[PDB]
Amino acid sequence: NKMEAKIDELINNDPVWSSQNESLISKPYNHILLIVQINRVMNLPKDQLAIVSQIVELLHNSSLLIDDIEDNAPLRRGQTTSHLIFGVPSTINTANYMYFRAMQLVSQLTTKEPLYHNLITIFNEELINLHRGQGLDIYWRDFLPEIIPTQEMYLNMVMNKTGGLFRLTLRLMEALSPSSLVPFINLLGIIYQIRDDYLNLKDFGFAEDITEGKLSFPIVHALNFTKTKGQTEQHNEILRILLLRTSDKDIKLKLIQILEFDTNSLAYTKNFINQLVNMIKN
Amino acid sequence: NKMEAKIDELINNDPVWSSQNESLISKPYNHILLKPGRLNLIVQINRVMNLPKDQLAIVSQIVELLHNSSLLIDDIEDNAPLRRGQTTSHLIFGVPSTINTANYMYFRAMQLVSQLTTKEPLYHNLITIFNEELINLHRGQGLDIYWRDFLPEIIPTQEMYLNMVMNKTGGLFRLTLRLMEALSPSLVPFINLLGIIYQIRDDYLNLKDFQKGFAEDITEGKLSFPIVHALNFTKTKGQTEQHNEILRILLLRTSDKDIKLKLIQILEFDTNSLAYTKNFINQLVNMIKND
Ligand SMILES: CCCCCCCCC(O)(P(=O)(O)O)P(=O)(O)O
Ligand SMILES: CCCCCCCCC(O)(P(=O)(O)O)P(=O)(O)O
Ligand SMILES: CCCCCCCCC(O)(P(=O)(O)O)P(=O)(O)O
Ligand SMILES: [Mg+2]
């Protein structure tokens, strides 16, 4: 009787969610928490610009939470990663929750049915590309040495992965522009990712990419260079170190030395970046 | 300048993605499809809804994709060793690929919504429903995981448990119903009640089948309906030792069969949570059938 009235009230109402439940679920996210120039070309009413910014931050910060779980990373922005503090379970769920909260902010960008559809299609396509690229980068790392990607394979993976959020931001803005730079943002994403792989080793930075076993741009060059020159032992030593998932700084340095002195992959990568930067700068 | 050409063809084209690539990253998902898992429920609701078969199939693929992908994530979150009688995908392909693939399929499911219509207004409503219920699904899952992982910081009351279920289990049931109603050329209250019955019966059988199954909810430390009743019952009656012993067992995350059986028998004889739950289920069932 009393129970029934309560069940009645419950099922006839929208699901109950308090501001306090929201805070509990947002903890892994708030922890990591600690465009306008592109707008000098797009000129979006500071209104929409606010939402696009929130969308990008939600996606970007959430994808980093997941990326850190996927790479078992101990640090991010100089502090202990969220999953080590709140646990992997809550961190995955919170990150995924923020993906859908970002998705909901898209509807406040516009109610114009034609443009709305376009915005959700862009959001959908680029999150698809982001995940395809991440899945490929993860697959090569976790199945090593089953597949050693080539430079071309690596660049296609980057166009999907890194290119995704770069293209997402640019395409949303362009579509809302009251006034294509995609080829340019793509080049920019490639530069940013290769430089990120390069600096991970040069700052050595804990050179966490080695510990993670990542097929970075220099590693890909080094593996294909040693394969081509028939340097079996060197090729194998590189694979052996990546497979150790080691945190030993001496071992990480040993690999970096193979890359500096045997395959000259760091100079190779620097050069490649300079040629890309030149394509923009020229 | 030959690199320049390659680079140019690269950046001026859509990202390259092959069917071989698609197959590689689909492994964790394909594995959960190997064993049968709904198409039923959808067809029953269609007696009321009358969706043409070609659209019913698409709603069906959407719910399938989301449900299966949810289970991949759920199993990682509960560190479940088995799903549908087989080794769990994360244990085979690893947590990283599995998280990524499950999340990838959430977006492939979203992409399918546009195979339902070309009418802009209706398209917008379907996406909004999709979006709302995925938000609700994660809100309830967030709470369920939080209570379990930070126990004994929060001991939910029956009411909090029911709101968590309305969000979590209610999410897929309402998503399915709302999409169909929005397509039909409200049974929401009914579907909410069906989901609550479904979840509580699920919590109940996980223990009763062990007292044919592994009472894995105990190994997972879950604040199930019978556990919620027992924790509040022991607190209310001043059964301090049993209240703390229930907490200690959950926190063990144990696979020991005898320890799980001890906890189930505490629910059976000491707190009468199993009988309480069996009756709560019957009463909810009565609210329907008798109407
Ligand atoms: C589906 C989530 C994909 C997130 C990818 C984010 C890129 C992260 C890196 O920038 P980081 O791990 O050095 O922060 P990447 O070098 O591209 O792996
Ligand atoms: C309408 C949402 C789906 C309802 C059906 C759920 C079936 C039960 C399982 O989720 P489980 O027995 O592994 O917990 P499935 O694996 O999909 O059969
Ligand atoms: C945002 C992911 C939500 C996943 C929800 C999965 C519910 C699965 C269960 O049906 P099962 O773990 O017994 O298969 P639940 O009893 O509700 O945990
Ligand atoms: Mg990096």
In angstroms, the CA A20 to CA A18 distance is 5
**The pairing of beta strand B86-87 with beta strand A79-80:** unpaired
Residue from A7, A9, A153 to probe the interface with B (highest B Cβ count within 10 Å) = A7
A124 is in an annotated binding site: no
Which chain B positions have a beta carbon within 8 Å of A7's beta carbon? 193, 196, 284, 287
Enclosing H/E stretch for A80: strand A79-80
Ligand 2 probe mutation, B43, B71, B220, most atoms within 8 A of CB:
B71
Experimental method: X-ray
Amino acid at A1: N
Nearest Cα neighbor of A182 from A169, A195, A196, A194 is A169
**Cα dist. A96→A71, A166, B101, B280 in Å?**
17, 20, 13, 33
The shortest CB-CB distance from A100 to any of B95, B134, B166 is to: B134
In angstroms, the CA A185 to CA A167 distance is 7
| Contact yes or no for A57/A191 (Cβ under 8 A) | no
Q: Degrees (nearest 5) of the Cα angle B4, B10, B16?
A: 155
| Contact yes or no for B146/B155 (Cβ under 8 A) | no
Residue A191 DSSP one-character state: H
Domain boundaries, chain A: 1-282
Q: Would you state the structure tokens that stand for residue A84, as one six-digit string?
A: 């080590």
Name residue, tokens 């090569």.
A140
In angstroms, the CA A62 to CA B60 distance is 29
| Contact yes or no for B117/A91 (Cβ under 8 A) | no
Is the CB–ligand 3 distance for residue B165 below 6 Å?
no
**b (16+ CB within 10 A) / e for B173-184:** bbbbbbbbbbbe
Within 10 angstroms of residue A224's Cβ, the number of other Cβ atoms is 18
Question: Cis peptide before B36, with omega less than 30 degrees from 0?
Answer: no
| Contact yes or no for A7/A61 (Cβ under 8 A) | no
In angstroms, the CA A13 to CA B192 distance is 10
Measured from CB, residues less than 6 Å from any atom of ligand 1 are A 63-64, 66-67, 71, 130-131, 134, 161-162, 193, 196
| Contact yes or no for B200/B225 (Cβ under 8 A) | yes
In angstroms, the CA B137 to CA B132 distance is 9
Backbone torsions φ then ψ of B96, nearest 5 degrees:
-60, -50
Strand residues in chain B grouped as ranges (E): 82-83, 86-87
Residue A251 CA, ligand 1 centroid: distance in Å: 24
In angstroms, the CA A199 to CA A76 distance is 15
Enclosing H/E stretch for A79: strand A79-80
| Helix ranges restricted to H, A145-231 | 151-176, 182-202, 208-212, 217-228
Q: Degrees (nearest 5) of the Cα angle B145, B147, B153?
A: 145
| Nearest CA distance, A127 vs chain B (angstrom) | 7
**CB contact set of B100 (below 8 Å; sequence gap of 6+):** A66, A70, A131, A134, A135, A138, B25
In angstroms, the CA A51 to CA A44 distance is 11
Amino acid at B177: L
**Cα dist. A230→A113, A125, A223, A227, A234 in Å?**
59, 41, 11, 5, 9
Within 10 angstroms of residue B120's Cβ, the number of other Cβ atoms is 13
Backbone torsions φ then ψ of B83, nearest 5 degrees:
-145, 130
Closest atom of ligand 2 to CA, residue B36: 18
Query: Which fold would CATH assign to domain B1-291?
Result: Farnesyl Diphosphate Synthase (1.10.600)
In angstroms, the CA A134 to CA A148 distance is 16
SS3 label, residue B202 = helix
Beta-bridge mates of residue B83: B86
**CB contact set of A13 (below 8 Å; sequence gap of 6+):** none
Instruction: Give the DSSP per-residue string, B51-117.
Output: --HHHHHHHHHHHHHHHHHHHHHHHHHHT-SEETTEE-HHHHH-HHHHHHHHHHHHHHHHHHGGGS-
Question: Are A15 and B162 in contact (CB < 8 Å)?
Answer: no
| Contact yes or no for B105/A96 (Cβ under 8 A) | no
Measured in whole angstroms, how far is the alpha carbon of residue A207 from the centre of its chain?
Answer: 17
CA torsion sign for B46, B52, B57, B62 is negative
| Nearest CA distance, A228 vs chain B (angstrom) | 19
Question: Are A279 and B99 in contact (CB < 8 Å)?
Answer: no
Q: Is B240 exposed, middle or buried (0-12, 13-18, 19+ CB in 10 A)?
A: exposed
Q: Would you state the structure tokens that stand for residue A131, as one six-digit string?
A: 């995940």
The number of residues in chain B equals: 291
Terminal C-alpha separation, chain B: 78
Beta-bridge mates of residue B86: B83
**The pairing of beta strand A79-80 with beta strand B82-83:** unpaired
Residue A117 DSSP one-character state: H
In angstroms, the CA B145 to CA A93 distance is 9
In angstroms, the CA A197 to CA A205 distance is 12
Question: Are A69 and B7 in contact (CB < 8 Å)?
Answer: no
Backbone torsions φ then ψ of B86, nearest 5 degrees:
-135, 165
Terminal C-alpha separation, chain A: 79
Beta-bridge mates of residue A80: A75
Beta-bridge mates of residue A76: A79
Residue B190 CA, ligand 1 centroid: distance in Å: 44
CATH code assigned to A1-282: 1.10.600.10
Instruction: Give the DSSP per-residue string, A233-266.
Output: HHHHHHHHHHHHT---HHHHHHHHHIIIIIS-HH
